[PDB]
């Protein structure tokens, strides 16, 4: 669940 645009890496 990448629920913010810059959350994942």
């Amino acid at each position, epitope marked *: *669940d*990448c*629920y*913010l*645009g*810059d*959350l994942c890496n």
Partner: antibody
Amino acid sequence: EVQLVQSGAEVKKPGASVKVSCKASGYTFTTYVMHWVRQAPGQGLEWMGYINPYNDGTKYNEKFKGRVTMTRDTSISTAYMELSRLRSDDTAVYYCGRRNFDYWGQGTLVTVSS
Amino acid sequence: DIVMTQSPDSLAVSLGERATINCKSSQSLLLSGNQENYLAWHQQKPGQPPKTLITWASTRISGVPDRFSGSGSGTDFTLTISSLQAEDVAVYYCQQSYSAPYTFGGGTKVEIKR
């Protein structure tokens, strides 16, 4: 039901600090970050930062980088926000919000006055 | 920082009539990796905590009535109220969740027209 329950209202004098809590239930606390968002009276909403409980990581708005600290306690599912050197225009209702701002706390009014 | 611009600032609408709130971002909110739009709509009444209505630009929060819907992509998003109810009088915010700081629009006040 997901619930974000914040501590109560504070009145502080200039220069003081305030630590506000937000206890989360209805889901697994470490699964989602916890944001803090404030609203000065009669103005809009403004993001301050978040803490990721899973790894204790933080991300602050460059507007409070040197004033705000966020913390968390995983064993009681509570996120904290501390604003130091309170000035008068820090008077606002402070909200915690989870994940992609899909659930909100009830707010904590902080009044900064001499 | 991404700038969120709403339009109009205040919207008068007759009871039962359609309400349209527009929100434009200075930057695309559509992540190309997963083809998702990072846009939420929040509802806020006088002296009340925000309440989330839409996330991912068009996903309705569980329990939000059908008359609310979100649409649009990239830089242009719309909140639609198909048939305005008395309980819908409030301020409505869009907020991007794409890149920090997670900025809000200026808000759109929605009032009963008379």
